[PDB]
Design a protein around this ligand. Structure first.
Ligand code: CA
Ligand code: CA
Ligand code: CL
Ligand code: CL
Ligand code: CL
Ligand code: CL
Ligand code: NA
Ligand code: NA
Ligand code: NA
Ligand code: NA
Ligand code: NA
Ligand code: NA
Lengths: 7, 236, 236, 7
């Protein structure tokens, strides 16, 4: 699963 | 405390250079040094902190997964005994990973979270706390596995409660928090239905708020929404 | 000497695990430990040594180039003064790179090269000596720049003399040596015509010997020949 | 320029 990128 | 003699502004400047050079261990050390100056972090500085340790732990997690897969294959039937080396080296990487996670959690506890009063900072740090307990949970197996999982859940839940009260549904921090809490449910908490419900509700509520955004904010929000959709496509 | 308590075979096993996990700093430390056991290295072990430090220094070289480019842009006309930070951090990376190069050269000098009697091992280590003096030369600027360059040239030349006497023109070590000596001429020694002549003669002499090879050896040799052609295409 | 790969 994908988790959040840094912005 | 090797960064104690360097100016805060110089540490931030060098963190940005390290990022350009893809020197993420350096970047993390610079940003740890900046945090330890004791002043609150700006939005940009919080991002730098997150980028640095995301990339450090990201490399460790990927290595740990390679080694764990080798270790598991070594313990099947018909597998030759190769001695303790695979286990030892997996443990070495695992211990270094736990040490990075502990370092981040220590910065959040001393004293980033307690000084964060604005919703954007408080949610950012509580999400980070959930994330790094989640990384600890990925490798946990013993008596504290359950308490590590509950520590992640508790941090994510406090962040969700604040974000829902204080942030619009399209806010990229709120979106990335929900994305990660959904992954926590699916991969850590054995709750795939909770993961799917969270991802779908988050996506739908952001969709209905996109009309309020500028083009630049729209681009930021839809980027994270696409990751939610990607996960739903993987999970359903 | 942190690897002094680990068995040689365990160090080699763990170097191979580190490679699979893309943990090249670990891999280099394991292979340094294996070298320091004092026994000669096999062909496979020499390759592991080379892979580990190639990737460590490769990351440092790429970072140094990013930082040097920023530093040079900071010293143009119309550039704002940003303080000493760029220079300082470039120096930090440069010093770490020099330390890795010094470590490799120290292993070669104590005592890999002196114990290497076979052409394949002696040429491999002398090429490595040239390579790591070449990396030192890429960042050198002061009184010792000329002696560093001459140290690289001398190592490469002794390796070439042996390889031409003792190895067929298609041997991948001989080919990679000539490739790298040609890059030395072009990028370090300000001798682009020597670089081009060397690459073309090396390529042509290998071409005429391919007919002697098995399919697997043919694949190994033509891989390096294509890099020679790629450079000639870049340089002409 | 390209330099030699590791085998
Ligand atoms: Ca505050
Ligand atoms: Ca010997
Ligand atoms: Cl180990
Ligand atoms: Cl759950
Ligand atoms: Cl520095
Ligand atoms: Cl020359
Ligand atoms: Na200060
Ligand atoms: Na073993
Ligand atoms: Na608000
Ligand atoms: Na032994
Ligand atoms: Na400055
Ligand atoms: Na021979």
């Amino acid at each position: 699963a994908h988790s959040s990128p840094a912005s | 405390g090797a960064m104690g003699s360097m100016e805060r502004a110089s540490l931030i400047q060098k963190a940005k250079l390290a990022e350009q050079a893809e020197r993420y261990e350096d970047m993390a050390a610079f940003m740890k040094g900046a945090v330890e100056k004791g002043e609150e972090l700006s939005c940009e500085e919080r991002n730098l902190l997150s980028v640095a340790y995301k990339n450090v732990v990201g490399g460790q997690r990927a290595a740990w997964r390679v080694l764990s897969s080798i270790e598991q294959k070594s313990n099947e039937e018909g597998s030759e005994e190769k001695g303790p080396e695979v286990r030892e080296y997996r443990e070495k990487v695992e211990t270094e990973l736990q040490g990075v996670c502990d370092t981040v959690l220590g910065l959040l506890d001393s004293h980033l979270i307690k000084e964060a009063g604005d919703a954007e900072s408080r949610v950012f740090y509580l999400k980070m706390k959930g994330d790094y307990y989640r990384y600890l949970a990925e490798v946990a197996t013993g008596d504290d596995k359950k308490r590590i999982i509950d520590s992640a859940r508790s941090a994510y839940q406090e962040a969700m409660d604040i974000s829902k009260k204080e942030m619009p549904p399209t806010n990229p921090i709120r979106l990335g928090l929900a994305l990660n809490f959904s992954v926590f449910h699916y991969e850590i908490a054995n709750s795939p239905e909770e993961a799917i419900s969270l991802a779908k509700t988050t996506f739908d509520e952001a969709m209905a708020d996109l009309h309020t955004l500028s083009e630049d904010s729209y681009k930021d929000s839809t980027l994270i929404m696409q990751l939610l959709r990607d996960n739903l496509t993987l999970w359903t």
